[PDB]
Amino acid sequence: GSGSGSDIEAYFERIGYKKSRNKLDLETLTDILQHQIRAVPFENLNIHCGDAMDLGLEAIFDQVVRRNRGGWXLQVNHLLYWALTTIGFETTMLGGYVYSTPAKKYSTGMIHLLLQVTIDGRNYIVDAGFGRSYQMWQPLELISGKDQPQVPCVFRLTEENGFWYLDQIRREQYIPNEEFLHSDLLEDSKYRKIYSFTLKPRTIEDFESMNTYLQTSPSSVFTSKSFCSLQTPDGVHCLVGFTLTHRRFNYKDNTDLIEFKTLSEEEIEKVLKNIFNISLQRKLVPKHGDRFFTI
Ligand SMILES: [Cl-]
Q: What is the DSSP string of 245-267?
A: EEEEEEEETTEEEEEEEEPPHHH
- What distance in angstroms lies between residue 291's CA and the mean position of ligand 1's atoms? 30
Q: Which residues surround ligand 1, an ion (CB under 5 A)?
A: 137-138, 150-151
**Active-site annotation holder among 35, 48, 78, 112:** 112
- What distance in angstroms lies between residue 154's CA and the mean position of ligand 1's atoms? 9
- What distance in angstroms lies between residue 236's CA and the mean position of ligand 1's atoms? 13
- What distance in angstroms lies between residue 211's CA and the mean position of ligand 1's atoms? 30
Task: Note if 184 is an active site residue.
Answer: no
**Active-site annotation holder among 35, 127, 237, 246:** 127
C-beta neighbour count of 146 within 10 angstroms = 12
CA 69 distance to own-chain centroid: 13
Give SS3 for 125: strand
DSSP string, 48-101: GGT-----SHHHHHIIIIIS---B-HHHHHHHHHHHHHHHT-EEEEEEEEEEET
219 is in an annotated binding site: yes
111 is in an annotated binding site: yes
108 is in an annotated binding site: yes
What are 201-208's contacts with CB under 8 Å, separation 24+?
A: 201/92, 201/93, 201/94, 202/92, 202/93, 202/94, 202/95, 202/113, 203/93, 204/55, 204/57, 204/74, 204/78, 204/93, 206/93, 206/95, 206/110, 207/55, 207/74, 207/95, 207/110, 207/113, 208/55
223 is in an annotated binding site: no
- What distance in angstroms lies between residue 124's CA and the mean position of ligand 1's atoms? 15
Label residues 218-248 b or e (16+ Cβ within 10 Å = b): eebbbbbbbbbbbbeeebbbbbbbbbbbbbb
Cα(124)–Cα(28) distance, integer angstroms: 13
Q: 148 near 140, Cβ under 8 Å?
A: yes
- What distance in angstroms lies between residue 248's CA and the mean position of ligand 1's atoms? 14
Task: Note if 112 is an active site residue.
Answer: yes
- Amino acid code (one letter) for 175: I
Hey, what domains does the chain have and what are their CATH numbers? 1-295 (3.30.2140.20)
Give the β-pairing of 191-197 and 42-43: unpaired
Task: Note if 78 is an active site residue.
Answer: no
Give SS3 for 284: coil
**Active-site annotation holder among 35, 48, 73, 78:** 73
Give SS3 for 241: coil
